[PDB]
């Protein structure tokens, strides 16, 4: 395995995410041998810790992932720490020093990765200071890993992008996308492009509609402070659903390189129809979860910290239209919500039914290619076969496949994947600015209608797949949801 020479700095190095996910992930890259000698990890935050105390912090962090004591300690030796205030410009000179000493001690020439595991409000400020205070490398690469969320509207995101471009280019920006870094999501291009029979049918001539579902069983729990301002539209649709749709709607790329993949995705994003008030009312649905069955499933307005006068959407369902010749007339239905029937992230490609008449009671029905992303990876294909009857008749059978236990064990952690791809300079599993800006332009149109109360707010029984308005949406084009719960 080839060695990766890099210097990673962790802003918010003492944070919960750093201990719980970040450090164990880079430890895995060490266990696999990607990180060997020529690497260093500088941690930073406000706390007044010295190197030994930080090393101890990393030690406790990777303790539940350690088999070999000597291997753990050899890794820990690559860490250092420097107390620093991100809002204090002068303070960056102290971090600059810790970085250069790390590069000298381990002989790293440039190749810097900056991780901002801090509050979103510091994101652009750090970026601008990395440039002005000269913490950027003059050799190799300079890559920035930005945590969620990337703005709360197109304006804020545009302002953020503007600040980041002061030190980096868009292709140096790696925005943490939890759903893009999923194994099954990465299987879509393989099934499509790797198999001529699907690749040739991935268009309007064979597909009736594409469905994307991100249902959850849980409610708002304690996250009401955040959720009441964001809702299903911002919390799930904007970032997680839009990017999955990006992999489904993309054109066929020139090659499988990140540049070509992004170009192919933007081809679809640039053809995405942005809606006005009338269309938002015609094509989208916003809902709030009402009473369930037992007293444990209380409505949204009775949840902890919910203002009672909240018109927050805990469910969203809508139709996306792309003005690309290959998707002309093919609706892309999306939906996501809290307190639904089952926890599941899936894509269902509904193929047009065949027009060959068998002369049977049951004629050929619509074939479906399902790709279950969460909780366990699975691929299913409901096809038309012959029924076991006396007279010739059709029926639909399901050919399926599920990930094996060996598959699950060999699957890299979401954060391991993301850190690794950044070190590689592979942006194929990351969204670019075009994809993110269009996603915001689309969602902003919808949000404008909602805050203005220019669209109805539906309700649904907790435990169902949403309100009937969601089914009304598909029935309008003669379609229906494949996953009924």
Ligand X SMILES: NC(=O)c1ccc[n+]([C@@H]2O[C@H](COP(=O)([O-])OP(=O)(O)OC[C@H]3O[C@@H](n4cnc5c(N)ncnc54)[C@H](OP(=O)(O)O)[C@@H]3O)[C@@H](O)[C@H]2O)c1
Q: How far apart are CA 84 and CA 122, in angstroms?
A: 13
Measured in whole angstroms, the distance separating CA 162 from the mean position of its chain's CA atoms is 22
Answer yes or no whether residue 413 interacts with its own copies by CB under 8 A: no
For 362, the token pair is 């049951």
14 binds, among its own copies, ligand X, none (CB under 5 to 8 A by kind): ligand X
Answer yes or no whether residue 109 interacts with its own copies by CB under 8 A: no
Give me the helix-helix angle, 258-269 and 242-249, nearest 10°: 100
In the list 107, 159, 199, 276, the residue contacting its own copies (rule: CB under 8 A) is: 199
Check: CB of residue 303 under 8 Å from CB of residue 224: yes
Closest to its own copies by CB, 103 vs 350, is 350
- The total number of residues shown for the chain amounts to 485
Per-residue binding letters, 367-406, with its own copies (x by CB under 8 A): x-----------xxx-xxxx-xxx-x-x--xxxxx-x--x
Q: Write the residues followed by a gap in the chain (C–N more than 2.5 A).
A: none
Output Rg (C-alpha) for the chain, integer angstroms.
25
118 binds, among its own copies, ligand X, none (CB under 5 to 8 A by kind): ligand X
Q: How far apart are CA 325 and CA 186, in angstroms?
A: 25
H/E stretch holding 43: strand 39-45
Closest to ligand X by CB, 152 vs 281, is 152
Shortest Cβ 81–ligand X spacing (Å)? 11
- Select from 426, 439, 446 the least CA-distant residue to 158: 439
Residues of span 233-292 touching its own copies by CB under 8 A? 252, 255-257
Contacts with its own copies by CB under 8 A: the residue count is 54
Shortest Cβ 348–its own copies spacing (Å)? 15
Check: CB of residue 314 under 8 Å from CB of residue 460: no
194 binds, among ligand X, its own copies, none (CB under 5 to 8 A by kind): its own copies
Q: Which residue spans within 117-266 are E strands per DSSP?
A: 142-146, 173-175, 207-215
Shortest Cβ 151–ligand X spacing (Å)? 18
Longest dimension (CA), the chain: 85
For 383, the token pair is 């096809």
Q: How far apart are CA 233 and CA 214, in angstroms?
A: 12
In the list 359, 451, 452, 453, the residue contacting its own copies (rule: CB under 8 A) is: 359
Answer yes or no whether residue 87 interacts with its own copies by CB under 8 A: no
Closest to ligand X by CB, 20 vs 454, is 20
In the list 79, 333, 351, 450, the residue contacting its own copies (rule: CB under 8 A) is: 351
In the list 53, 273, 410, 425, the residue contacting its own copies (rule: CB under 8 A) is: 410
Closest to ligand X by CB, 86 vs 443, is 86
Residues 6+ apart with CB under 8 A from 411: 183, 403
Closest to its own copies by CB, 15 vs 412, is 412
List residues near its own copies by CB under 8 A: 32, 183, 186-187, 189-191, 193-201, 206, 252, 255-257, 351-352, 354, 356-359, 364, 367, 379-381, 383-386, 388-390, 392, 394, 397-401, 403, 406-407, 410-412, 420
């Amino acid at each position: 395995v080839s060695e990766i020479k890099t210097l990673v700095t962790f802003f918010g190095g003492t944070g919960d995410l750093a201990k719980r996910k970040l450090y164990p992930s880079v430890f895995n890259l060490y266990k696999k041998g990607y990180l060997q000698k020529h690497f260093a990890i500088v941690g930073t935050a406000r706390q007044a810790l010295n190197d030994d105390e930080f090393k101890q912090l990393v030690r406790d962090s990777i303790k539940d992932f350690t088999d070999d004591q000597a291997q753990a300690e050899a890794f820990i030796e690559h860490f250092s720490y420097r107390a620093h205030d991100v809002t204090d410009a002068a303070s960056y000179a102290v971090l600059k020093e810790a970085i250069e000493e790390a590069a000298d001690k381990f002989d790293i020439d440039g190749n810097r990765i900056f991780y901002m595991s801090v509050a979103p409000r510091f994101f652009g400020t750090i970026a601008k200071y990395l440039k002005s205070e000269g913490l950027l490398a003059d050799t190799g690469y300079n890559r920035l890993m930005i945590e969620k969320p990337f703005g709360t509207s197109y304006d804020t995101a545009a302002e953020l992008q503007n600040d980041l471009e002061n030190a980096f280019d868009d292709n140096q920006l790696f925005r943490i996308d939890h759903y893009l870094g999923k194994e099954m999501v990465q299987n879509i291009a393989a099934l499509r492009f790797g198999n001529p029979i699907f690749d040739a049918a991935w268009n309007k001539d064979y597909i009736k509609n594409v469905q994307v579902t991100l249902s959850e069983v849980l409610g708002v729990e304690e996250r009401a402070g955040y959720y009441d301002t964001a809702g299903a539209l911002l919390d799930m649709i904007q970032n997680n659903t839009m990017q999955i749709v990006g992999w489904l709607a993309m054109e066929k790329p020139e090659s499988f390189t990140d540049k070509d993949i992004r170009a192919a995705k933007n081809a679809a994003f640039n053809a995405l129809k942005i809606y006005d008030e009338a269309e938002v009312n015609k094509y989208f649905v916003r809902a709030q979860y009402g009473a369930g069955d037992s007293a444990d499933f209380k409505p949204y307005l009775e949840e902890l910290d919910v203002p009672a006068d909240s018109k927050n959407n805990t469910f969203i369902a809508g139709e996306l239209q792309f003005d690309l010749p290959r998707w002309e007339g093919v609706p892309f239905y999306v939906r996501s919500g809290k307190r639904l029937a089952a926890k599941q992230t899936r894509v269902d490609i509904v193929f047009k039914a065949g027009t060959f008449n068998f002369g049977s009671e049951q004629e050929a029905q619509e074939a479906v290619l399902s790709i279950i992303i969460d909780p366990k990876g699975a691929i299913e294909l409901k096809l038309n076969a012959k029924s076991v009857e006396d007279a010739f008749n059709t029926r639909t059978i399901d050919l399926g496949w599920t990930v094996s236990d060996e598959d699950k064990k060999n699957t890299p952690e979401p954060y391991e994947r993301m850190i690794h791809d950044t070190m590689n300079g592979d942006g194929s599993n990351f969204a670019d600015w075009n994809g993110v800006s269009i996603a915001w332009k689309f969602v902003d149109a919808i949000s404008a209608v909602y805050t203005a109360d220019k669209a109805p707010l539906e309700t649904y029984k907790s435990g169902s797949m949403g309100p009937e308005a969601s089914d009304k949406l598909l029935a309008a084009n003669g379609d229906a949801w494949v996953f009924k719960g």
